Design a protein around this ligand. Structure first.
Ligand SMILES: *C1=CC(=O)c2cccc(O)c2C1=O
Ligand SMILES: *C1=CC(=O)c2cccc(O)c2C1=O
Ligand SMILES: O=C1C=CC(=O)c2c(O)cccc21
Ligand SMILES: [Zn+2]
Length: 470
């Protein structure tokens, strides 16, 4: 088959980096009247990405012609298409041509992905072209493609470069809303903003206190969204919050922001849906039915994690110590729900085995079936029982990326208990903080900005306190 032949010869070109043979074989196929499918086009886009930048080489600038033709042909793009299209646009380094690709996708009814907007946005950011960056941003907005931190930080940086205090403000609110805690680089960038001449010079001496007060009630708390307040130089300090969310520097008590229980039942349904896709339906169903018949619970334990975190092998001591300590902080002394592999319940010291059976008899242990991923079980139990989740799982794994970066991090902060162990004292339960670890804007315009960290028990979390000295 002549379509199946072109595949064999194109498969050779990508595994050699042979761009000129692919551009010859593309033209030969058009001579032969051979129609190119998804796979043919994706391989040519990838192969063209290997060319670098005298004037444009015929690998890159031909790559966009192949892209434009693929769209005209109405060959539906898959995820490899968007990726290769993006890395072609990255290697070219022409932001205006990157953005032209996205416009073509829009005109032909194709949803662009986040990585499609990157080369454009980041290109216009490097060149200091704020108006083009903002066009790209508005196009993302209308396409319903949600920016993550890198895109937001570029918009912030370009807004700082063009003295656009209004856009800095709006982008800072978008970081709060979407990201919550900022990477090191963004954090440094926000510090720079607050120390800058433009920030010193933008503000108001007098504003309507009630209009602010109503906005605070309106937004859920911890921000108002009405613009910069106060005047004069900002006092900008790197500081920390104490255990109660009091700023060490200015003594403001940070706010604790509620979760809307409607978002929670939505999240619960999404977990069920995501889990049923990956587990054997009847296994996850069986767990749901068992859970409806048991409880109430004050806490759910990731049994594998409590047995294995900081251990060379499974410590029943550590699991048992953790069960006992959760029971002890339960106002009515409920046993926590231990989720553990059936593999692990069957361990080899008889009194430990009998305790695992007693917890199961007490309605406080569920042995997950062989093949299952425990994570879905302990997630679904904690969410549905509206209780604490005791786990030190870092949650890097692909699974957790499916849960989203808005609701689930907020839920996690309110529900997650982690264990820490010292020589001196043994095992400690680290409880959810009595405040929200998020960018906050106070009623008089004081800002607290949390840096993001891998582990906030290992490393003490840096915050920025930006307060008007007048
Ligand atoms: C916040 C305010 C302040 O005046 C001050 C002074 C000395 C040392 C500090 O850390 C701070 C501070 O964090
Ligand atoms: C926010 C505020 C608060 O006082 C509190 C107290 C106990 C447990 C919590 O999770 C919270 C909270 O999230
Ligand atoms: O779509 C579903 C996946 C798993 C599951 O347990 C389930 C369910 O229990 C009820 C309706 C839908 C689903
Ligand atoms: Zn402060």
């Amino acid at each position: 088959s002549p379509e199946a032949l072109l595949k064999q010869k194109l498969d050779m070109c990508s595994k050699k980096g042979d761009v000129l043979e692919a551009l010859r074989l593309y033209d030969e196929a058009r001579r032969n009247g051979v129609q190119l499918s998804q796979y043919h086009y994706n391989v040519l886009l990838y192969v063209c990405s290997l060319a670098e930048a005298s004037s444009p080489n015929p690998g890159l600038s031909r790559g966009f012609d192949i892209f434009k033709q693929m769209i005209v042909d109405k060959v539906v793009p898959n995820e490899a298409t968007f990726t290769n299209g993006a890395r072609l646009a990255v290697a070219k380094d022409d932001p205006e041509m990157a953005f032209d690709m996205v416009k073509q996708m829009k005109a032909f009814g194709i949803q662009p992905r986040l990585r499609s907007y990157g080369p454009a946005l980041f290109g216009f950011c490097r060149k200091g072209d704020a108006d083009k960056a903002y066009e790209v941003d508005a196009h993302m907005v209308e396409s319903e493609v949600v920016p993550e931190e890198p895109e937001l930080a570029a918009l912030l940086k370009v807004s700082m470069d063009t003295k656009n205090a209004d856009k800095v403000y709006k982008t800072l609110q978008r970081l709060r809303d979407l990201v919550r805690q900022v990477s090191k680089s963004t954090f440094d960038m926000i510090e720079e903003w607050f120390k800058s001449e433009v920030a010193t010079k933008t503000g108001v001496k007098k504003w309507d206190v009630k209009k602010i007060r109503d906005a605070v009630v309106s937004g859920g708390g911890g921000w108002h969204g009405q613009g910069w307040l106060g005047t004069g130089k900002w006092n900008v300090k790197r500081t920390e919050m104490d255990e109660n969310g009091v700023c060490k520097c200015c003594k403001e008590k940070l706010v604790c922001i509620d979760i809307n229980p409607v978002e929670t039942e939505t999240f619960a349904a999404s977990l069920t849906r995501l889990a049923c896709e990956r587990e054997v339906k009847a296994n996850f169903n069986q767990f749901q039915e068992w859970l409806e018949r048991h409880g109430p619970f004050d806490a759910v334990i990731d049994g594998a994690n409590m047995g294995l975190v900081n251990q060379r092998s499974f410590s029943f001591f550590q699991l048992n110590n953790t069960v006992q300590r959760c029971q002890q902080i339960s106002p009515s002394k409920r046993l926590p729900l231990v989720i553990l592999h059936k593999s692990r319940v069957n361990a080899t010291y008889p009194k430990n085995r009998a305790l695992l059976e007693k917890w199961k008899n007490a309605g406080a242990l569920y042995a997950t079936p062989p093949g299952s991923n425990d994570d879905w079980y302990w997630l679904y139990a904690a969410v549905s029982c509206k209780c604490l989740l005791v786990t030190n799982d870092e949650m890097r794994d692909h699974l957790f990326q499916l849960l989203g970066n808005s609701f689930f991090p907020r839920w996690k902060e309110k529900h997650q208990v982690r264990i820490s162990v010292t020589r001196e004292d043994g095992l400690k339960l680290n409880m959810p903080p009595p405040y929200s670890i998020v960018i906050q804007e106070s009623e008089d315009g004081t800002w607290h900005v949390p840096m993001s960290v891998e582990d906030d028990l290992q490393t003490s979390r840096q915050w920025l306190c930006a307060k008007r000295s007048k």
